[PDB]
Write a protein that binds this ligand. Structure first.
Ligand SMILES: C=C(O[C@H]1C=C[C@H]([C@@](O)(CCC(=O)O)c2sc(CCOP(=O)(O)OP(=O)(O)O)c(C)[n+]2Cc2c[nH]c(C)nc2=N)[C@@H](C(=O)O)[C@@H]1O)C(=O)O
Ligand SMILES: C=C(O[C@H]1C=C[C@H]([C@@](O)(CCC(=O)O)c2sc(CCOP(=O)(O)OP(=O)(O)O)c(C)[n+]2Cc2c[nH]c(C)nc2=N)[C@@H](C(=O)O)[C@@H]1O)C(=O)O
Ligand SMILES: [Mg+2]
Ligand SMILES: [Mg+2]
Ligand SMILES: [Mg+2]
Lengths: 537, 538, 542
C-alpha cells in the first residue's frame, strides 16, 4: 500500500531532518503519518506527545522547538484543530519558531458543501506560514518507486528548510499536507538528509562610529556581536549577552545617548520605545530576517553586522556605569524598604536563585519585565519567552515542552527548567498540566507562580491612575480567587504555597519532576513601589 | 497643502531616493495625487514617466523597464479592476524575481462594503504572489503629526523597496503598495514637502545583502552544467560542458548544445538558476539516478529534479574534469551544431527556426535581445546562439503570452537609459525582439505609446509570422488567424515592413529608426519534418 | 473511465440548470469536462466560445450571462488563467453575475514547491466568490454508480444555486473544481428537471413610507420594480428598470428640495445624487435585494426590500418636479445645438434617439453611461447593460459581444424575423482597452446584429469635468488625465477584419437604422477640449 510506504518515507526524512518530537491529539480521523509515527516512537527514533487540549498542544510544540532549537511537528486530526492551533501558529510566525503543521486532506471526498471533520479552514494560514506544501496522493506504480521516493524526500526537505530557515534565515510555521485516500525505500547513505543545505550567511555591514555616545538595545532574537561587547547594553532577558557592560533599563531616561544600536526586536520598557522614536537620535537596526522592527519609522539604517570605527568616550562610558549602579541601588533599596511581597520581589528571588546551565521560562506581562528590573545576569543561562505576540496563553505547556526538549538534549550527552509566570497566565493554560501516565513528563521542571490575584501590570498604566480606582479593579484587575493548590492536586501535581524567603532554599533542593511553587503577592502597592523606585532615581 | 498631496509627494520623493528611475502610470481620478506628484518629478527630470492606457500590458512594460537595467520600477493606477489587471504581470514578476512595485490608489478602507463606486478588496488581492502587501494609513488632517507621519510614510516606502529588490532576502519580486486616498485629491492653489534625509539618502538605508552558501563539488566526476533563468556567474565552472538557456549568463566558453545532452551520460549535474526550457533537460533531471547540485543566487531552488543532493550559491571545487570527458562533450556539441545547420540548409521553406537563426547571426556585442517566451527562445537555443556580450531578456517566470511587446519596449527604454547615464557619444545600443505572430497580435496594443510618451530610440521587433503556430479549445488553430500585421502596426502608428529572411540581416543594420516592426513570413507546415530531420541527423 | 462518466453527469446537470454558454481558452493542460462539453457542443445542447485572451474571455462570459440572465461557465486551463480572470470575477461579484469558474486540480501531483500550470493562485477567490466546491476524484465503483450520480448532481446543483442566488437572492461567481488524474451516462431526474429543485424564493422586508412627504426615487444598478412607487419623480440610472412613467432628469435634482428619498438598488452616478443621499436632514430609505445595502455616508435611515405606502405625492410637488424636469431637458437640448463641436454628449443624444423597443443597449463606463442619462434616454422596452459592479473600462467590448450573442440566442429559441439589435456606446479609451475582443475565429459564434458605437475624443473626456479639469492644471493634466493616443480605429478594425465606418453625428441615426454585417464598429470623432465649458453652459441655462 503506497500510503503506508509514503508515510514511512516522510517520517524517516523528518527524523533525518532533526525532528525529535511530534505532538498529536485524538480526533475524528486518524493522524497523518499515524502508524509510521507509532513505529518510529516505539523504536525510539522519535518521541510522541499526546494531548486532549488542541490549543495547549500547539504551545507544547512551541516549547519542544525552542527547548533545543529543533523543528517540531504537530498533527491535525479534527474539525477544531485549525482554530485551536491558531494562537500557537501565530506565535511561531512572529517568534520565528520551526513548527511543522501536519494535515491530511481527502481528495476523493467533496469540499465546500458542508462542515468537514478533519479540516475547518480559517484565514490565518495564508498570512502566518513560511510555506504550504501538499505531497500529492500516493499511487500504485512499483516501477516508479525510486522516483516517488526522491519526490517525497525532496518535498519533505523543502518543508524542513522552510521551517528551520535553512536558506532564508527566517524560521517559522509550515503547513504540510499528506493527502489520504482510505521494506522502506532508503534515503541517503549514513542518515544524511535527501537534499542537504550547507550553512548560510546573510551579510549586511553597517558603518558605525562608536566614538559617538552609543547605547545598545537588544530584544528577542538578537544576535551576538563581539565588536560591541564594550558598549553599555540594555538587554531584554531573552537576548543573548555580547559582553560585560550592562545598563539597567531605568537608567536610560537618566542618560542622553546620541545614537542607538538596536539588536533584534525590543518589546519592553517605555523609555526604550521613547528613545527609538527620538528623531534626533540615529538608530541602527542589526537583525536577522526579512523585516526589521521600527514602530516610529525613525531608523536610519538596517543590517546584520557593524563595521565599527573609533571607541566609546571614557566620559560617556563612566556616566553610563554611574547611572547603572544608581538604578540597581534604587531597585534593591525600595524592595527592602517594602513590607508587602509583590511580583517584583518574587522576580528578584527567582533571579538570584538561578545557576549556570539553567533554563528560565518567563511569562508575559510583569514577570518578563520584573526580571529585567531585578537585574538578572543572563550569561550562562538560557531564557525563553513567547515574545512573538506576547500572549498570556499557552505558557504552561511551553515551559513543559521546553523542559522536555532541554532535558532530552542532555540525556543525549538533568538541568533545571524554572518558569516564572503570573496567576492569570497560569489559569489560562492550567490544562497543560494534564498529562497522562503514558506521556513524556519533565524530570526537572519547577513552575513559580507569582499570584497577586489579577493583572498587576495594569496598575502601572494610565488605567492604574487613582482616578480610575472604583472602575479599574473589575475590568483591568480581574480578580479570580482561584485555589491554586487545589487545582494542581486536581491534576496530581506537587504544589507548595510559600513566602519569598523560602523561594531560594526551596528551588535549591529537587523534588518531583513537575512541581508548582506558589508565592502570594500584592498588586495594590505596585504603582507606589515603582513610583518610589524612580523617586530614588 | 492638503494631506493627499503631501502624502503623495513624500512617497514619490522617497521612491526616487530608493533608486526608482522609471514609473508607469495609468489614468484615473482616485490616483490623482500620485499622478500629479509623478508628473512633477518627471518635469524636474528626477524620473521618467510612462503613461499607458491598459493596466495589464502596462505591468509588463514595467517588467521590461526593470529587467533592462536591473532597477526597481513602479506602476501606478486607480482603484478597482485597474489593480486586478496587474495580476498577470505580478505572477510573472514573482517567478522571474522582478522588482515590480504595484502602487495602487484606493478609496479609504472604511468605504469597503458600503456600495461605494469602484471599490473592491484591494489589500491582499495578490495573495502569496507578492513579497509583501503594505498599506499606508489614510493621511490625517493634523499639522502637529506632520513630522511623525513623514517618518512613517518614508519608512514604509523603504520597506516596500527593500522587499521588492530583495535587499534583505536576496529574493527580489513584486510588492503591493496600496495607498488609501480621500478628497481633496488635487493640489491646493499655492503661492512645502516635509524633507527626507540630508544628501538625498533613503530614509532607512538598507544595503544589498550578500547571500552566501558554499558547496563542495568534485569536478573529476563527469559533469555537465545546466544553467537556466536567473543563473549566477561561476568562473570556477567555466571550463565544464554547459547547456545554457539564452537568458542565462555564460560563465565561460565550453558550450554544449541541448540536443547533444541526451546522447551523453554525465555522472553528475550542476544546475544553475531555474532551467525550464528544454525537454531533454527535463528528461535528464527527471531520472533520479544522476546526482544534481543546485546553485542559485537566492534562497529559492528549483523542484525540477527530485535528486538534488544539495543547494548552494557557489561551488568549492576539488579535482578537474577528465580530458576524455571534455573531448567527448565537445565532439558531440559540434555534431549537434552541424546537424542543425545542415538540415536547415536542406530545407527550402522558411520556418521560424530559419528566422531565429537569421536573427542570431545578425547580433553583435552590446545588443539587447528580447525573446518571446514560447517558440523564439527555443528556436534561438536550437540555432545555437552564442550569448556572450549580449543581454538576453525573456519572461521565463511563467512564460505567458501576455505583455511581450510592452516588455520589449520597456527593456529597450531602460537599456537605452543606462547608456545615457554614462556620457558616451555613441548611438544608443540596439534592442532586437523576436516574437511569434500570435504573441504579437495578442499584445499588439502594447505598441500603443501616446504622442507625449517616451519612445525607444533603437528597437526593432522581428515578427516570425507562420500565421498561428487533442483538445476542443485547439480548434481556433484549425485555420490561420489571418490578422493583418501591417494594419495592426498602422493603427498604433508604428513603422512596419514585411520582408524576406535573406533581407533580415541587412535591414537590421540599417540605422535605428526609433521603433519598428519587421514582419517575416514563415511556414509551419514543414516544421514537424524539419525537427524530425534534425533528430535523425544525430 | 470514471472521470469521463463524471464529466458527462456534471455537464448534463449544468445544462439542466440553465447553462447555454461555456467559455474556454487553450491552455497547457486539458480543460475541465473538456470532452463532455465538446460532445454537448456538437449535439447542440450547449454552445462553446473559444478565445486566446483569457481576460477578454472572462468578460465575454459576463456578457453571455447578463444578456439573458443565464448562468455561464468559464474554464481555467493555464498558469495565467486566475490572474487574467480576476477583473471579470470581481465585476461578477459586485454586479451579481452568475459566473461559474471551472477548474481541475491534480491530487496526484505535488503542490506549493514551485510553478503551477493548472492554477497559480492569487488572493481574490477568498473574497469574491459565493462558494468554492470541489467534486472529489471519480472512483471506479460500478456498485456505487447511482450513489455517485446522486452526489455529483447534488453538488452541481449547489454550484448553480450559489451562482444564480436561487436561495440567497445573491447571484455571483462560484469556484467549481473537478479534480483529475492524468491522462453511457447515468440519468438525471425525469422530464429534464434539475436533481435538486429550488422553487421560487422571496426575501420580504417591508418598510412604512408616507408618500405625502415630498419624495424622490433614485434607482441604480440592480434596482427592483415597484408598482406602488410608479407615480413618484424618479431619477433612474440607465441600467435600472423603470417602475413608472414620471422621470426626473438628473440635472433637475439639485433644483429641488426633496424631504424624502427612496433609493432603489445601487446608485453610482451623478454628484447631486451622492450629495442628496448624504444629506443628514433627508430620510433615505434603501430598497434593494441582497445581503448588503448601499450607504457611503451612513446617513440612511432604514433598509428593506419593498415599501408599504400611505398617502400620495402632493400635486404641487409633482408640478414642481415636472417644471424643473422641463428646464433640464431644454437646457441640454439648447446647449447641444448652440455648441458646434461634436462631443460624447452629442453622440449619446444621437444613439438615444435611434433606439427602438426590443433593442439591447450596452454602455461603457466613464462619460457614455452618464451622457445617456443626461440625454434623457427613455429606457422602457429597452434592455440596458453596463458593468457598474466596479465600473471598469476593461473588457467592455467582449461584454457587448457576449451580451449580443446571449440576447440573440434567446430570440432564436422563440422561433419568431431578424434578431433584435444590440447597440453598444463606449469611449475610445474603453475601446482600446479591449480591442482584442474583436478577434473571433471563424470556428466561434459571432453576433448577427451587434453595432459598437465608439465616441472617440482621443482620451478620457470625463476628467475634463472633474477638479483636475480646472484650467489651472491645463499645463500638466494632458499627459496624466487626458492620455491622448492617436489610434487609427479604422485600421484596427481592418486588422481584425471587422466592418467599420467613421461617420459624423448627423449620420449616426440613419446609419444605425440600416443593418450591416453581424458585427460592425461605428466611429464618431469627438472633442473634449470644449467639454467643461459645455457642461458649465448647460448648468447656467437650467
Ligand atoms: C506593556 C504595556 O502595554 C501592554 C500591557 C498589557 C497587555 C498585555 O498584552 C501585556 C503583554 C506583554 O507585552 O507582556 C497583557 S498583560 C495581561 C495580564 C497578565 O496578568 P498575570 O497575572 O498573568 O501577570 P501579572 O499579574 O501582570 O504579573 C493581560 C491580560 N494582557 C492582555 C492579554 C490578553 N489575552 C491574551 C491571550 N494575552 C494577553 N497578553 C497589552 C494589551 O492588552 O494591549 C498592552 O499592550 C505598556 O504600555 O507599557
Ligand atoms: C465620476 C467621478 O470620478 C470618476 C472619474 C473617472 C474614473 C473612472 O473609473 C470612471 C468610471 C465610472 O465611474 O464610470 C474611469 S473613466 C476613465 C477614462 C475613460 O475614457 P473613455 O475614452 O473610455 O471615455 P470618455 O472619454 O470619458 O467618454 C478611466 C481611465 N477611469 C479609470 C479606470 C482605469 N482603469 C480601468 C480598468 N477602469 C477604470 N474605470 C474614476 C476613478 O478613476 O476614480 C472616478 O471615480 C466623480 O468624481 O464624479
Ligand atoms: Mg497577576
Ligand atoms: Mg506562430
Ligand atoms: Mg474618450
Amino acid at each position: 500500500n503506497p500510503s503506508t510506504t509514503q508515510a514511512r518515507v516522510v517520517v524517516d526524512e523528518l527524523i533525518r531532518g532533526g525532528v525529535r518530537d511530534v505532538v498529536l491529539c485524538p480526533g475524528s480521523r486518524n493522524a497523518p503519518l499515524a502508524f509510521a509515527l507509532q513505529d518510529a516512537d516505539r523504536s525510539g527514533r522519535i518521541r510522541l506527545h499526546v494531548r486532549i487540549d488542541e490549543r495547549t498542544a500547539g504551545y507544547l510544540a512551541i516549547g519542544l522547538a525552542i527547548g533545543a532549537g529543533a523543528p517540531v511537528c504537530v498533527a491535525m486530526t479534527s474539525g477544531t484543530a485549525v482554530a485551536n492551533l491558531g494562537p500557537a501558529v501565530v506565535e511561531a510566525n512572529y517568534a520565528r519558531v520551526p513548527l511543522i503543521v501536519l494535515s491530511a486532506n481527502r481528495p476523493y471526498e467533496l469540499l465546500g458543501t458542508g462542515a468537514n471533520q478533519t479540516m475547518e479552514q480559517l484565514g490565518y494560514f495564508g498570512t502566518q506560514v513560511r510555506a504550504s506544501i501538499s505531497l500529492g496522493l500516493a499511487e500504485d506504480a512499483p516501477e516508479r518507486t525510486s522516483a516517488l521516493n526522491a519526490t517525497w524526500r525532496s518535498a519533505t526537505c523543502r518543508v524542513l528548510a522552510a521551517a528551520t530557515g535553512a536558506r532564508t534565515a527566517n524560521a517559522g510555521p509550515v503547513h504540510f499536507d499528506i493527502p489520504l485516500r482510505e521494506v522502506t525505500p532508503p534515503g541517503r547513505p549514513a542518515g544524511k538528509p535527501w537534499t542537504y543545505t550547507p550553512p548560510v550567511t546573510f551579510d549586511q555591514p553597517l558603518d558605525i562610529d562608536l566614538s559617538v555616545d552609543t547605547v545598545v538595545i537588544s530584544g528577542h532574537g538578537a544576535g551576538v556581536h563581539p565588536n560591541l561587547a564594550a558598549l553599555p547594553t540594555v538587554a531584554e532577558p531573552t537576548a543573548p549577552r555580547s559582553g560585560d557592560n550592562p545598563l539597567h533599563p531605568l537608567a536610560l531616561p537618566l542618560l542622553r545617548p546620541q545614537q542607538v544600536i538596536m539588536l533584534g526586536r525590543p518589546t519592553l520598557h517605555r523609555p526604550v520605545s521613547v528613545l527609538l522614536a527620538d528623531a534626533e537620535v540615529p538608530v541602527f537596526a542589526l537583525t536577522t530576517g526579512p523585516r526589521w522592527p521600527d514602530v516610529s519609522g525613525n531608523s536610519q539604517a538596517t543590517g546584520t553586522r557593524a563595521v565599527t570605527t573609533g571607541a566609546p568616550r571614557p566620559a560617556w562610558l563612566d556616566r553610563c556605569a554611574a547611572m547603572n549602579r544608581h538604578a540597581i541601588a534604587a531597585v534593591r533599596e525600595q524592595l527592602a524598604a517594602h513590607p508587602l511581597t509583590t511580583g517584583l520581589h518574587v522576580a528578584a528571588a527567582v533571579s538570584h536563585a538561578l545557576r549556570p546551565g539553567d533554563q528560565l521560562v518567563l511569562g508575559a506581562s510583569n514577570p518578563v519585565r520584573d526580571v529585567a528590573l531585578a537585574g538578572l545576569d543572563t550569561r550562562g543561562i538560557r531564557v525563553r519567552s513567547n515574545r512573538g505576540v506576547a500572549g498570556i496563553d499557552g505558557t504552561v505547556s511551553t515551559a513543559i515542552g521546553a523542559a522536555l526538549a532541554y532535558e532530552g538534549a542532555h540525556e543525549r550527552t538533568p538541568p533545571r527548567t524554572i518558569a516564572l509566570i503570573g496567576d492569570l497566565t497560569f489559569v489560562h493554560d492550567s490544562s497543560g498540566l494534564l498529562i497522562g501516565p503514558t506521556e513524556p513528563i519533565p524530570r526537572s521542571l519547577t513552575i513559580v507562580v507569582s499570584n497577586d490575584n489579577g493583572g498587576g501590570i495594569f496598575e502601572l498604566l494610565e488605567q492604574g491612575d487613582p482616578r480610575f480606582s472604583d472602575v479599574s479593579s473589575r475590568i483591568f484587575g480581574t480578580p479570580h480567587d482561584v485555589d491554586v493548590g487545589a487545582l494542581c492536586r486536581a491534576y496530581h501535581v506537587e504544589s507548595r504555597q510559600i513566602e519569598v524567603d523560602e523561594l531560594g532554599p526551596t528551588l535549591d533542593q529537587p523534588g518531583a519532576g513537575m512541581r508548582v511553587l506558589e508565592v502570594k503577592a500584592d498588586r495594590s502597592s505596585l504603582r507606589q513601589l515603582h513610583a518610589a523606585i524612580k523617586a530614588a532615581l
